[PDB]
Amino acid sequence: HSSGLVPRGSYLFKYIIIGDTGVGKSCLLLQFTDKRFQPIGVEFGARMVNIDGKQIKLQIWDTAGQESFRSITRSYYRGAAGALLVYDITRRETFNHLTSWLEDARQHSSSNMVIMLIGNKSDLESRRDVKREEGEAFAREHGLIFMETSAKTACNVEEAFINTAKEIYRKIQQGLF
Ligand SMILES: Nc1nc2c(ncn2[C@@H]2O[C@H](COP(=O)(O)OP(=O)(O)O)[C@@H](O)[C@H]2O)c(=O)[nH]1
Ligand SMILES: [Mg+2]
């Protein structure tokens, strides 16, 4: 995919969503863009958001399941303004792989990319395998924002995408982007 010219006065933020297979990356995308959950046929989902009164299009790229069998292509990472780095709170091994995903994002995306750490599947509290505090600590260590989300119930999904956008916008307005 290649996005077109951005209309004057508006913004376009390319997002990526990375993490182990099955953590809910695709469901997060669709919950945000479509407000639906159905346990993706497209390279990306798009949605208009409003940040500081401005029109900002978020174009959220999906890995197309490639991480289940091969490396993620460099083209996927390129030009991203935002990344959700996702693990599944019910599976510790997905939390163990965060450092490796983060290192790849930092190797292949712009240094200015805003990364939010996401512990997904918060609705499965009885199956929790990673404590909230562990996610919080990882985020602090790596200078990331952190939320727990449920793509299923939509808990914190809007906030994850919008708060990431607010931060990108803040960096732009500060010339730090
Ligand atoms: N209970 C629950 N299940 C989820 C959630 N997010 C995703 N799933 C389920 O997790 C599985 C993997 O989701 P998917 O979006 O394909 O993960 P991806 O491989 O990381 O893109 C599917 O069976 C989803 O229905 C969530 O927040 N809660
Ligand atoms: Mg997927």
UniProtKB/Swiss-Prot annotation:
Disulfide bonds: none annotated. Its EC number is 3.6.5.2. It comes from the Eukaryota. Its cofactor is Mg(2+). It is found in: Cell membrane; Endoplasmic reticulum membrane; Golgi apparatus membrane; Cytoplasmic vesicle, Secretory vesicle, Acrosome. GTP binds at G22, V23, G24, K25, S26, C27, G65, N120, K121, D123, A151, K152. Keywords: Cell membrane, Cytoplasmic vesicle, Endoplasmic reticulum, ER-Golgi transport, Golgi apparatus, GTP-binding, Hydrolase, Lipoprotein, Magnesium, Membrane, Metal-binding, Nucleotide-binding, Phosphoprotein, Prenylation, Protein transport, Transport. GDP binds at G22, V23, G24, K25, S26, C27, N120, D123, A151, K152. GO terms for biological process: defense response to virus; Golgi organization; innate immune response; macroautophagy; positive regulation of exocytosis; positive regulation of type I interferon production; protein transport; vesicle-mediated transport. A motif (Switch 2) lies at residues 64-73. GO terms for molecular function: GTP binding; GTPase activity. Its main location: membrane. Expressed in kidney, prostate, lung, liver, thymus, colon, pancreas, and skeletal muscle, and low levels in placenta. Not detected in heart, brain, spleen, testis, ovary, small intestine and leukocyte. Mg(2+) binds at S26, D62. It is an enzyme of class 3 (hydrolase). Switch 1, switch 2 and the interswitch regions are characteristic of Rab GTPases and mediate the interactions with Rab downstream effectors. The switch regions undergo conformational changes upon nucleotide binding which drives interaction with specific sets of effector proteins, with most effectors only binding to GTP-bound Rab. Belongs to the small GTPase superfamily. Rab family. The small GTPases Rab are key regulators of intracellular membrane trafficking, from the formation of transport vesicles to their fusion with membranes. Rabs cycle between active GTP-bound and inactive GDP-bound states. In their active state, drive transport of vesicular carriers from donor organelles to acceptor organelles to regulate the membrane traffic that maintains organelle identity and morphology. Regulates the compacted morphology of the Golgi. Promotes cytosolic DNA-induced innate immune responses. This is Ras-related protein Rab-2B. It comes from Homo sapiens.
